[PDB]
Amino acid sequence: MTELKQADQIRTWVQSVLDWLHISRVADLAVYIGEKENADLFIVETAALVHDLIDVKLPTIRLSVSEVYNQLVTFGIGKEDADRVIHIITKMSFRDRLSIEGKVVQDADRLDAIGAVGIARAFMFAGAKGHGLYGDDQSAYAHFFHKLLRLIDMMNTDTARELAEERHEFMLQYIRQLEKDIPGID
Amino acid sequence: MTELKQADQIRTWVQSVLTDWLHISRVADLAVYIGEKENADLFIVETAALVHDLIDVKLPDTIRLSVSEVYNQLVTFGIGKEDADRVIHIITKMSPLSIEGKVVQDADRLDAIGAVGIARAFMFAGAKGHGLYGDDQSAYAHFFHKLLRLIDMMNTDTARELAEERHEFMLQYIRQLEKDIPGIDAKT
Numbered sequence A: 001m002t003e004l005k006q007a008d009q010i011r012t013w014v015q016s017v018l019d020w021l022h023i024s025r026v027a028d029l030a031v032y033i034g035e036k037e038n039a040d041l042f043i044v045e046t047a048a049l050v051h052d053l054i055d056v057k058l059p060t061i062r063l064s065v066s067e068v069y070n071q072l073v074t075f076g077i078g079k080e081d082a083d084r085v086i087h088i089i090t091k092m093s094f095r096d097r098l099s100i101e102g103k104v105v106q107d108a109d110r111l112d113a114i115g116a117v118g119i120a121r122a123f124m125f126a127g128a129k130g131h132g133l134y135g136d137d138q139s140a141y142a143h144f145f146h147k148l149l150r151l152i153d154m155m156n157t158d159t160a161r162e163l164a165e166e167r168h169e170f171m172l173q174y175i176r177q178l179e180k181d182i183p184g185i186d
Numbered sequence B: 001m002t003e004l005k006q007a008d009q010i011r012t013w014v015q016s017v018l019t020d021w022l023h024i025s026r027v028a029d030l031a032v033y034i035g036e037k038e039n040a041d042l043f044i045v046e047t048a049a050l051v052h053d054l055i056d057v058k059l060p061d062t063i064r065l066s067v068s069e070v071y072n073q074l075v076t077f078g079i080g081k082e083d084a085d086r087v088i089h090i091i092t093k094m095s096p097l098s099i100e101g102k103v104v105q106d107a108d109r110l111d112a113i114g115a116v117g118i119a120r121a122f123m124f125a126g127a128k129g130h131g132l133y134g135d136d137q138s139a140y141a142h143f144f145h146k147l148l149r150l151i152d153m154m155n156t157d158t159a160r161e162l163a164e165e166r167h168e169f170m171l172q173y174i175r176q177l178e179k180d181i182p183g184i185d186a187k188t
């Protein structure tokens, strides 16, 4: 099982390149969902680990599709697995953006944007970008209704839909409470 | 009402100075609510709540006021010397406190817990480049080290009651993180 070795190298590489905590969470989740959805677990974990490397959001860090490709083949990963990972990540991040493995990776990514973890990230992002808690259309509170509260209805697989239900319900109890703590938050 | 007009004056001033205001507005509403239940002087409570942050070291240097600047503006705005002195004694102590000072302190701490405290913790982490969890500067660490202890330091019966709901909700939020992120407590 050389795939253990290869998976471990990608983790170190990615951790090096770079948040890592998001990537790690998404990979753990992708592996879990992929197992229940009969996807290729190597592909799903690997795609999860590198799903952010080619994004335009990242500054000096952003890698090219071929840089990522070359690194995987350099680690000894096969052409077909490297090709399939690239098809996943390149299908996932272009401006204004499936197979079993692609759907699982996307689901994992989206699950990480809801629930208690999703709420944390929403407020973290707002803090980083100088945005308000509420009071603006760019605020974190607004983004729950613009985006986060709809994600459950866009999940690809039965397994991700299952996991979503609990995370979605909790975000709702969170919003209800926030609205109670701050009357006129809207 | 002369005090209604003075509070509205102070409100517009503070909002103009800080131009954070949302925190101050929430703290003033909470403080007046507690103050009324506790039979504290409501004008002093509201005024202190409104100016409680203006001298705080955490404000940037382009905005932060000296104590004399706060004092002078209050007096110009028509607050009497004695009331103005009371307000100054509260905010310099915050940055035993008086009865009104304890009410303001409680309101300020209430805003740091519950659903609103959760949001604020994560916003701060994002502002300072700190992680969600995984080290001692992380938001998660900050819950254990500081925010989960605030309920023990509430001054008033009214605040203590309000803090129980908020604290318990924050405990539910932690439980949810622990569930969704296996190993979160040990993660680095």
Ligand code: NI
Pocket (backbone or CB within 6 Å): A022, A026, A051, A052, A109
């Ligand atoms: Ni992602």
Ligand code: NI
Pocket (backbone or CB within 6 Å): B023, B027, B052, B053, B108
């Ligand atoms: Ni404050």
